[PDB]
Amino acid sequence: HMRAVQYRTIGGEPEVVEVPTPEPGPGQVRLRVTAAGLCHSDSFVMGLPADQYTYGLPLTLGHEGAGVVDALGDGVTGVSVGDAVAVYGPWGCGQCHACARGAENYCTRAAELGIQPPGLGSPGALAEYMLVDDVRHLVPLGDLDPVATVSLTDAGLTPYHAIVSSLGALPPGGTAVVIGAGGLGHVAIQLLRAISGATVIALDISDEKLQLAKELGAHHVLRSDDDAAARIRELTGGVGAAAVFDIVGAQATIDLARSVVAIGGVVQIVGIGGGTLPTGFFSTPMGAAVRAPYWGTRTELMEVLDLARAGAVHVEVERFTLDQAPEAYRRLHAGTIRGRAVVVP
Template identity: 60%
Template sequence: MKAIQMVKAQAEPELREVDKPSPGPGQVLLKVTAAGACHSDDFVLNAPPGALGFDLPMTLGHEGAGVVAEVGSGVDSVTEGTSVVVYGPWGCGVCRFCSQGLENYCSKAEELKIYPPGLGAPGAMAEYMIVDDPRHLVPIGDLDPVSTVSLTDAGLTPYHAIKASLPKLVGGSTAVVIGSGGLGHVAIQMLRHLSPAQVIALDVTQNKLDFAKSVGAHEAVLSDSDAVDNVRKIVGKDGVTAVFDFVGYQPTIDIAMGVVGTLGDVTIVGLGDGSATAKVGYWAQPHEVSVRSPYWGARTELLEVIDLAHNGVVDVALETFSLDDGVEAYRRLAANNLRGRAVVVP
């Protein structure tokens, strides 16, 4: 079968012929119907040799959708022909966090060398993929897998980030979304649906700001040296209630810490190399500001995100590619010239 694989570090992926896998005991074989490309893939592809701990070559794709094609012995909770998406942050299933559905924070994953598909384990950028356990499958019914697959990360990650701040996002509150790309444009839609907060989007070009407003942002501000002043002109002296930074580099973190108000939240989601450390302290920011750096989301939250999709709440902007053209999707991703998400359709 065909698969897009990371063959060596700091090189673009390759379309290769590999053996079709067979499910072992407790496993499920999916015929892939859609696979999403993500900036996390770009981060992995550009990591130094040996830095990530897993063997190469590796099939990419941590956003996966498919139809159950075959089940291994002992699997009776899913049936062939079921349309599903894959919950990506696999864990041991039994530690304190996994028992709460928080496999994204599994305390034994590193020790047991458990990797997410496409981020260490073979992923969805192929004609078929193995899912380690049926608990990592979420049926999607009649939802289109192509328009749904990105919700496994681009939907789940912002949902998990936003959910913790919802008690603060009441009438009269303000939320800032920094970066209106693949995850940020979904976050804007979720904030508009889940809260009455005023939503302000920040990005680096007018085209991206126009895009942010088209998906629901009330206001849009250039992310430049004047961003803090311009946001504060909108929100006033009380500052912003919750900031969601989907970039994570030092300039955006500095903006987040510069606009947040008393009792506010700063949530750093992006994989940039910035840090809020120098900005946190009694004299450094308004009182009782909380700074978090979450990772992905819980299994139960993916169920909730899929329910939102059934209700028509989120509309993921995407561009589609065939498996034969999938390497081009990664080139476009690296060049940062995609509008929304890239989805590969085998």
């Protein structure tokens, strides 16, 4: 009845399979999927041992989703069949203190209630159709290209969230360091330019990726190696960086972040790569804050899409078919994706 990309066996690769076409229950909506982004978080999930994997098998992947509204569940109002929409991913209960400010990413009853994001417990977007639990998890696209913008649902939303949180500690004329210019990173750079006055130093491990970072707005680019810290120190007059966004989050990138963050600065550990930053006296500088944020808010998604509309941010897309999804994931693990891999089913 419909085609989809699923994780089905622990330690195995994602596979294109045929599954039932779902029907919207009451409250729910079905989208005909127009675009679906691939995220390195998916590689992280599939790289988990059986004892640590909690999302059930099979799992349709894909938590960056956009589409056209296909069918309405019982009692649904707010959207009409035919509306083009992006999917807000980090679902929450809707009612707690956090959910009420739109910050369903920090919902305090989601684990207890078994609420799970699409592609991370609930059925994802890498399919011809998908279900969304509730109308508040849908944002209008207007006449934004779904393929061009779908990744703003995470590749944009997540670093935007990290940046907005950090703005107090990034005055104009301060310096922001971005470690990793990939899916999130290449959007992170653009977002720092759009809404701060900060000088942006990007880092990565291919010249080719550094060149894209330069073009996307990075004032300075640097290889992520042993020299990085000292060059960043030189670039900031020895003061260090007011803000550091680590989009890798390995021990070594975190170590780098610790050596270059300024007095009173902030480190957002965005990338999930196995490290921790030892925060405390004589480890991190005085006044320096460290945080590992997760995804972002409903308002923030809308805001990121509005930046797309205004031409202030865009995704560098590498386009694929549904059948190529496995192939594309292999490319992503190998580091041969330029920007974001996006599937059009």
